[PDB]
C-alpha cells in the first residue's frame, strides 16, 4: 500500500547512511521495522512480557527455565521459536543470568539461519553492519573477548562449535557489531524495557540535532520525521540522551561508536552552560548519586528511587537550580517514582519543575518531552487545575501527534482528556 520513501546511500565520510527520496513533513512515518532479534533487558526481566514487552499485572513463568515470563499463552507460543534454544541455556545458567548482549546475540545466530529473508534486513543485513573493528581500542577488544567466552559457555548446551553456525558469522565481530548497532527498546512512555537489532534502521547516522526520531510499539520500531526534510537530505537520529554535555556526548560517541561528532551543537558547546548551572562542587555529588538512582529505576525499584531522590532534592533546594541537568534528572526520577507509588500531588510538585528545562533541552518535537508534558498535564487535571492542564494537554498533543503519530493510543487518551478538561473550563 505504502511507497518506500528512504534509500541507503554512500556518504563522504560516515560510511553508509539513509536519505529521503521524496520530500518529508514532520510526523511522516518513514519506516516500520521488526527486530532481527530482541530480548527483555536485565532490569525488566520479570516486569514486562518477554514477547510483547508490555507491563502486565501478572505474568506466567516458562515452566522449564522459570526465567522467561509471558502475559498469556498466545505470547508464550509466539515466542517459543525465539526461546527454544535459550531455555535450556537460561535454566542451566541459574542462579546466573547472562549479559543482555550475550542473550541478544544468542537469538541472532538462529535468525541468521532462516530461509525466510528478514523483513528487518531489507535495506541492510546483519553482515553489512559496521563493526568498527579497525578502530577498537585494546580495552574494548579485551571486553569483547570476554563476551565471546561468556557466549561460548552460555550457549554450550546448543552450540559446541563454529561449524554449527554460518561460515560468514564470526563471534568476535558479532559482538563488536552488537555494541554499536543495538537499540534500546522503550515502551510508549519512553521507559527502557529491552534491546534489539534492527539492521535496516542501523543505516541512520547520528546527529545531536536530528531530523528524525524513533518510538516503539512493543518490539516494533517506528521511524518518523520530526522536521521538514528535502529529497536527498540525509536522515539522522540522535544516538544519545539529550541531557548530556558536549563533553559527555563526545566521550560516549568515542567509546561506543568510534567517532567524533562534528554536528554544529558539538562545535559550539550548545547549551553546555545551562546544563551546568550551579557550582561543580555541589552538582558533582548529584552526578555521582545518579549512577545508583538510575540502576534502581532500570529495576523498577520505585520506593528506593524516591528515597534517594528526596534526600538529594531536599538538601540542594537552596543552592542548585533545577535547570542543572543532574538535578533535573533527579526530579524526573522522583516524579516517575511518585506516579508509580500513587503519590500524585507530590509527582505534580517534581513534575512541574522539569517543564521549563525540558522545553529548553528538548527542542522542537521530541517524544521524551511530549510524554513529560503529557504526564504533568494529567497530574494537573487530577488536581483540578484545569486551565493549566488544558495548556499542557494541548501541547503534548501537538508534540506527540508528530512523534507518536495520530493513530497512537496515547493520542486517543489525550483527546478524551482535552475534552473533559475543556468542558470543566467552560463550566467554570
Amino acid at each position: 500500500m505504502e511507497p518506500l520513501k528512504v534509500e541507503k546511500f554512500a556518504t563522504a565520510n560516515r560510511g553508509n547512511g539513509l536519505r529521503a527520496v521524496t520530500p518529508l513533513r514532520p510526523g511522516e512515518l518513514l519506516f516500520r521495522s521488526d527486530p532481527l532479534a530482541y530480548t527483555v533487558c536485565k532490569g525488566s526481566r520479570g516486569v514486562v512480557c518477554d514477547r510483547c514487552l508490555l507491563g502486565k499485572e501478572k505474568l506466567m513463568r516458562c515452566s522449564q527455565c522459570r526465567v522467561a515470563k509471558y502475559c498469556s499463552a498466545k505470547c508464550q507460543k509466539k515466542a517459543w521459536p525465539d526461546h527454544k534454544r535459550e531455555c535450556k541455556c537460561l535454566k542451566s545458567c541459574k542462579p546466573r543470568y547472562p549479559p543482555d548482549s550475550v542473550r541478544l546475540l544468542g537469538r541472532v545466530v538462529f535468525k541468521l539461519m532462516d530461509g525466510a529473508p528478514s523483513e528487518s534486513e531489507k535495506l541492510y543485513s546483519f553482515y553489512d553492519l559496521e563493526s568498527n573493528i579497525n578502530k577498537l581500542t585494546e580495552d574494548r577488544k579485551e571486553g569483547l573477548r570476554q563476551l565471546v567466552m561468556t557466549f561460548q559457555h552460555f550457549m554450550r548446551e546448543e552450540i559446541q562449535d563454529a561449524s554449527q553456525l554460518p561460515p560468514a558469522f564470526d563471534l568476535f565481530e558479532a559482538f563488536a557489531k552488537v555494541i554499536c548497532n543495538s537499540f534500546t527498546i522503550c515502551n510508549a512512555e519512553m521507559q527502557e524495557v529491552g534491546v534489539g537489532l534492527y539492521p535496516s534502521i542501523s543505516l541512520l547516522n547520528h546527529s545531536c540535532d536530528p531530523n528524525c526520531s524513533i518510538v516503539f510499539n512493543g518490539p516494533h520500531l517506528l521511524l518518523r520525521a520530526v522536521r521538514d526534510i528535502e529529497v536527498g537530505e540525509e536522515l539522522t537520529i540522535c544516538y544519545l540522551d539529550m541531557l548530556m554535555t558536549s563533553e559527555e556526548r563526545r566521550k560516549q560517541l568515542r567509546d561506543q561508536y568510534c567517532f567524533e561528532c562534528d554536528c554544529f551543537r558539538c562545535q559550539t558547546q550548545d547549551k553546555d552552560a545551562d546544563m551546568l548551572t550551579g557550582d561543580e562542587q555541589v552538582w558533582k555529588e548529584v552526578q555521582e548519586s545518579l549512577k545508583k538512582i538510575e540502576e534502581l529505576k532500570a529495576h523498577w525499584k520505585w520506593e528506593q528511587v524516591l528515597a534517594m531522590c528526596q534526600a538529594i532534592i531536599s538538601s540542594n533546594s537552596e543552592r542548585l537550580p533545577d535547570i542543572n541537568i543532574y538535578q533535573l534528572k533527579v526530579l524526573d526520577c522522583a516524579m516517575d517514582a511518585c506516579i508509580n507509588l500513587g503519590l500524585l500531588e507530590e509527582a505534580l510538585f517534581y513534575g512541574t519543575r522539569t517543564m521549563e528545562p525540558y522545553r529548553i533541552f528538548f527542542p522542537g518535537s521530541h517524544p521524551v518531552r511530549g510524554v513529560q508534558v503529557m504526564k504533568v498535564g494529567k497530574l494537573q487535571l487530577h488536581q483540578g487545575m484545569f486551565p493549566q492542564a488544558m495548556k499542557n494537554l494541548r501541547l503534548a498533543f501537538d508534540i506527540m501527534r508528530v512523534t507518536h503519530g495520530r493513530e497512537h493510543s496515547l493520542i486517543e487518551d489525550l483527546i478524551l482528556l482535552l475534552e473533559e478538561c475543556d468542558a470543566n473550563i467552560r463550566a467554570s
Partner: peptide, 7 residues
C-alpha cells in the same frame, strides 16, 4: 548502556 538511547 547497551543500545542507542531515544532521548
Amino acid at each position: 548502556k547497551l543500545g542507542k538511547s531515544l532521548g
